Write an enzyme that holds these catalytic residues in place. Structure first.
Site, PDB file in Angstrom:
ATOM      1  N   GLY A 167     -15.174  14.916 -32.044  1.00 52.33           N
ATOM      2  CA  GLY A 167     -16.134  14.817 -30.940  1.00 52.33           C
ATOM      3  C   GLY A 167     -16.789  13.456 -30.788  1.00 52.33           C
ATOM      4  N   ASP A 177      -8.209  19.851 -30.909  1.00 53.36           N
ATOM      5  CA  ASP A 177      -8.945  21.090 -30.729  1.00 53.36           C
ATOM      6  C   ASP A 177      -9.011  21.806 -32.081  1.00 53.36           C
ATOM      7  OD1 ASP A 177     -10.206  23.390 -29.506  1.00 53.36           O
ATOM      8  OD2 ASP A 177      -8.184  24.301 -29.351  1.00 53.36           O
ATOM      9  N   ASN A 208     -18.113  16.952 -36.035  1.00 52.20           N
ATOM     10  CA  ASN A 208     -19.243  16.841 -35.126  1.00 52.20           C
ATOM     11  C   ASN A 208     -19.130  17.856 -33.977  1.00 52.20           C
ATOM     12  OD1 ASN A 208     -21.660  15.510 -33.916  1.00 52.20           O
ATOM     13  ND2 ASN A 208     -20.129  14.579 -32.539  1.00 52.20           N
ATOM     14  N   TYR A 243     -29.416  28.737 -33.099  1.00 51.28           N
ATOM     15  CA  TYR A 243     -29.675  27.514 -33.822  1.00 51.28           C
ATOM     16  C   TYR A 243     -29.977  27.789 -35.298  1.00 51.28           C
ATOM     17  CZ  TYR A 243     -31.984  23.410 -35.650  1.00 51.28           C
ATOM     18  OH  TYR A 243     -32.371  22.338 -36.446  1.00 51.28           O
ATOM     19  N   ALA A 244     -30.879  28.716 -35.560  1.00 49.67           N
ATOM     20  CA  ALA A 244     -31.229  29.033 -36.941  1.00 49.67           C
ATOM     21  C   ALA A 244     -30.063  29.613 -37.718  1.00 49.67           C
ATOM     22  CB  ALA A 244     -32.412  29.995 -37.001  1.00 49.67           C
ATOM     23  N   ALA A 245     -29.265  30.453 -37.079  1.00 46.92           N
ATOM     24  CA  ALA A 245     -28.098  31.040 -37.751  1.00 46.92           C
ATOM     25  C   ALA A 245     -27.060  29.992 -38.078  1.00 46.92           C
ATOM     26  CB  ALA A 245     -27.471  32.128 -36.905  1.00 46.92           C
TER      27      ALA A 245
END
Ligand code: O74
Ligand code: O74
Lengths: 242, 241, 239, 240
Positions: free
Chosen positions: C14, C64, C91, C147-149
């Site tokens: 990325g 990919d 990334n 986000y937290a997971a």
């Protein structure tokens, strides 16, 4: 028919609960009372100590309201000496209590927890049995300084509790903490409505916690069934973590 | 009054892997707290053992066969329970080489997710639920075993935290229990030198009993644990790893 | 002088913009040969152009990470034309239930790419794998869950893989950014930007280069006893 | 970039091992370096070591437990060498009941020194504070308790102080070493050494220089958005 639940009974134990004159501390004093323990609740002022004693009588709980200042070696030694003489040894103990204020606050809380804990430990060591339970602060602090204070105290409480639990384990004394989240108290009531609404919005259960909901967790920790639980900080926050 | 908060009278509980040790201890504890209890196993013989065990302890319920890896077995077993016993509103999930950790965690969590998702309809309808995930016992031999244990524990705790956020508004709680060195058929297989070395690392100075896990689970299942969610409660005698 | 990546080959997924680009350039400037990748042929052109323009030997390729074939193929190409990549840098309004598939997909991608580059690192008895977590900004409660997971999963994953590959002197670390100035964070509505900034003690957004410098250090010989770590780069805003 | 040219750095407990390796690394990155010790002989050793490695600076005596020694040592540094804008706190039978006093002392000392060097950093609107945690001290349970308590305390402290001083572009980070070569680890019989190494994925002890490099990076302009962090440097052995 309700007889299986007699094993969660604290019949024949004595429990000391600091800062018991209102909210969380009060709900804990009553819960342990209701589970059968003799309960000594404490406050910094003589009027709070009166309120506790009144509250205990009114709920059918044998015990007492005393004055205790956990920052004083003298007040601690004195209060314990009184309790042993008049009521028995307390083998269940529940400790409940600017940009730059965080360090002094944590330093003071933990020096207090250590002072009280060390004093009640001689008794628990002799008995080869004990429950120490440290209650952390409630979420709500305004602004960044308040977040810093809350987060520092919580980190300190959790490391402390872990360490003391390692130190006193061989004597079958457990040391645990309870980390409340957004609980309905005098302090959280004085938050302005916008900030209360914003905190709720961050709580998956969608409501404030009740003082009784902290007290029940404490009651379980104090029981014989929690005997293999030590060094733990149990979060009671409706799913809102920092 | 003290026990109104503890009782599970009129709740139905599903407990997977209930044929022995921890799972068995939990089936019995929830039973004794008043719940109707369905314990499950992968084999028909285990399911028989469960049903026998429940009857012998005066607990209304059943022993069934359940494979949490199968969407079919899950849907089927739930259907059966709803028809014969009621909706389970308490659900307790219980149930090497260098590179195996990733597949193990992936499998455990996919199994938790599958079972949890299926029981959630029932809980949503009732606006009440308890999901409780039991982590693995300490003991695993060598470095690959430690990697597996530590990964599974980190996965269990993150998973539990996330699902708790997802289902909170419906007054369903999701918690986990992380045991330490507990006396089980698996830890009894450990040679004495390794048992002694593990003990030495436990401040309480003893192995934990299955019942000691089960009591924690019993509490989390109660109305008094209603504001506890997203938590992983360690039951390990002070040995943290 | 001492923090040079002279003679190392680095793969940076990325890499066509923001954080990934900043990393490609930072490793390049530290002396590495750099292969940046993108999901599209146009991104891969952009990368190769960007590398030339900054005086960095390497290439822009299409990759990919969800595809076993694209991964095996891209690595085969790199080994044949450029050398073995011994530095690898991964990334690359939500609904309440999406978190599980997202984490499952991110980590299956990390695992897939990491496993493939490991044969090369094992041969060399040296390696650096560096996983970049997602930027803070996600809208609402479902986004916070996600986000937290992902963050928890990234940390545990990184720890575990680090245990697996340590004996071969390969380190595995992660970088957990906070509120960084990217195209994605620029498009956040102003109320949410202002609220995030107010929660950052340094009082500013982080720059892509600031993530890249941490990555550059981790890739260096001086970070050799750092493994299994997730380094937060968030100006003091933790969650 | 990576150069600390034109910065002054104070490094406590710099007379040997980790603290020494850090003094030299910051020196080699271009900083002027003041290393400190509790004793006059240690302060001599530091000054000798710095001169021998081509590093401008000084060796001083500093007792971080003393408000007087702290105020005095800073005063001296400002007058003779400049304001220290990089500060690295390193400093310093085992029983299971010692952990509390140890943490209480370490953190009161960090607080005292940190607060004093902050005036300077506030006026400059730039700073780096870097706290070094304790290597593992002893293999017992007590060694674990102490180690884990200090580490937990260091992390929370570092996080809090970083929140307090962030608006002034001062970063506060810590570095948590694991096992480095020590007298204690040198005396392990081969079986216990193999078992300790076996718990470290990299399969070796860490070098003082490996801690020092991490510190050097944290001190650089490139680490400017890293604050409140504790960076573990333990070869993959995590313990708490
Ligand atoms: O693979 C892991 C290794 C250590 C810690 C967590 C993970 C992990 N975690 C997963 N899930 C996860 C981890 C942390 C928080 C939430 C979730 Cl779902 C996961 C999901 C699907 C497939 C593989 C997964 N692996
Ligand atoms: O005693 C401890 C055991 C484990 C982890 C932390 C502490 C501890 N922590 C302390 N402070 C602390 C802990 C976490 C965040 C911030 C601070 Cl100040 C502390 C402060 C003053 C005196 C004693 C203290 N002890």
């Amino acid at each position: 028919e309700n007889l299986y639940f007699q094993s969660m009974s604290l019949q024949g134990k004595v429990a000391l609960v600091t800062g018991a004159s209102r909210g969380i501390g009060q709900a804990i004093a009553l819960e342990l009372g209701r589970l059968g323990a003799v309960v000594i609740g404490t406050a910094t002022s003589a009027s709070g100590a009166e309120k506790i004693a009144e509250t205990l009588k009114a709920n059918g709980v044998e015990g007492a309201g005393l004055v205790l200042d956990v920052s004083s070696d003298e007040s601690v030694a004195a209060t314990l000496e009184h309790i042993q003489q008049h009521l028995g040894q307390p083998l269940i103990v529940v400790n409940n209590a600017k940009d730059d204020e965080w360090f002094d606050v944590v330093n003071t809380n933990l020096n207090s927890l250590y002072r009280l804990s060390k004093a009640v430990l001689r008794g628990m060591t002799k008995a080869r049995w004990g429950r120490i339970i440290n209650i952390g602060s409630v979420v709500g602090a305004m602004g960044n300084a308040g977040q810093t204070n809350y987060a520092a105290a919580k980190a300190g409480l959790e490391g402390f509790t872990r360490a003391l639990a390692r130190e006193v384990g061989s004597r079958a004394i457990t040391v645990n903490a309870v980390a409340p989240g957004f609980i309905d108290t005098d302090m959280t009531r004085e938050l302005p409505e916008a900030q209360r609404e914003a905190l709720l919005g961050q709580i998956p259960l969608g409501r404030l916690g009740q003082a009784e909901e902290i007290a029940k967790v404490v009651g379980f920790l104090a029981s014989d069934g929690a005997a293999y639980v030590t060094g733990a900080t149990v979060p009671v926050n409706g799913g809102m973590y920092m």
